[PDB]
Design a binder for this molecule. Structure first.
Ligand SMILES: CC(C)C(=O)Nc1nnc(S(N)(=O)=O)s1
Ligand SMILES: [Zn+2]
Length: 257
């Protein structure tokens, strides 16, 4: 199975998922001086007031919080998007040390972690259909740097001990993802892909310029998770990030000057 190790990591994924070498792969380095301000871009509309979180799960490659996506409860619209995108789940990518962990980079800078809020276009009816469409998904990416704690992240951090190994899940109701968002919704956007297999080229990426700060204690709890299932040799879930991929024939647009 694919993973992040020497023998099954990102450099191997193309063998099972040949689109890994495709024309719109993610993540990418965001060269801030080359991204063009696009005044036609609209402000992002993040409507999370009615979000219904359901469960938190260790899937062997990250941990994810899943939401009820059977109704327009927590939706993303505006920005570069046409139509309405329902929040399905969020998860993180992080490093073994604070100097790596993000998937996107900014002028080659790596952040300690990156949060992905994954949404799918309601015109396609379900996420499985959406993944087969070039505009099927919108992933809101938020960088994490280490400094002050993020209070809205603590409820997530405190339950991670109950999902240490692959396959574990827990009830995770009444979590408000608005507590994970930075002040500014200034963003970069570009057409890309899922960053884990199957690497489908179905995503409009919306990457916020402003990171959130999390504390060393919060990220250290991420690093206690395990890639392995219970009973297997313990392998810390760290460095679950795909490196930046070739930009190829793509322009990154900025919502801000
Ligand atoms: C629910 C399912 C289709 C899903 O969300 N799959 C993802 N695969 N990579 C993602 S990422 N790291 O680009 O946000 S999301
Ligand atoms: Zn992700």
């Amino acid at each position: 199975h694919w993973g992040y190790g020497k023998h099954n990591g990102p450099e191997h994924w193309h063998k099972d998922f040949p689109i890994a070498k495709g024309e719109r792969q993610s993540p990418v380095d965001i060269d801030t001086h080359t991204a063009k301000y696009d005044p036609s871009l609209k402000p992002l509309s993040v409507s999370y007031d009615q979000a219904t979180s359901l469960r938190i799960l260790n899937n062997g490659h990250s941990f994810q919080v899943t939401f009820d996506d059977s109704q327009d409860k927590a939706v993303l619209k505006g920005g570069p998007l046409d139509g309405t995108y329902r929040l399905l789940q969020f998860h993180f990518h992080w490093g073994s040390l604070d100097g790596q962990g993000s998937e996107h980079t900014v002028d080659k800078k790596k952040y300690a972690a990156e949060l992905h809020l994954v949404h799918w276009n309601t015109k396609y009816g379900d996420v499985g259909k959406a993944v087969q469409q070039p505009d099927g998904l919108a992933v809101l990416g938020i960088f994490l740097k280490v400094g002050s704690a993020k209070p809205g992240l603590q409820k997530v951090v405190d339950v991670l001990d109950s999902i240490k190994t692959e396959g574990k899940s827990a009830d995770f109701t009444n979590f408000d993802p608005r507590g994970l968002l930075p002040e500014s919704l200034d963003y970069w956007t570009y057409p890309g892909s899922l960053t884990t297999p199957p690497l489908a080229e179905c995503v409009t990426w919306i990457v916020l310029k402003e990171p959130i700060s999390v504390s060393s204690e919060q990220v250290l709890k991420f690093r206690k998770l395990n890639f392995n299932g219970e009973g297997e040799p313990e392998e810390l879930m760290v460095d679950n990030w795909r490196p930046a991929q070739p930009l190829k024939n793509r322009q990154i647009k900025a919502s801000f000057k």
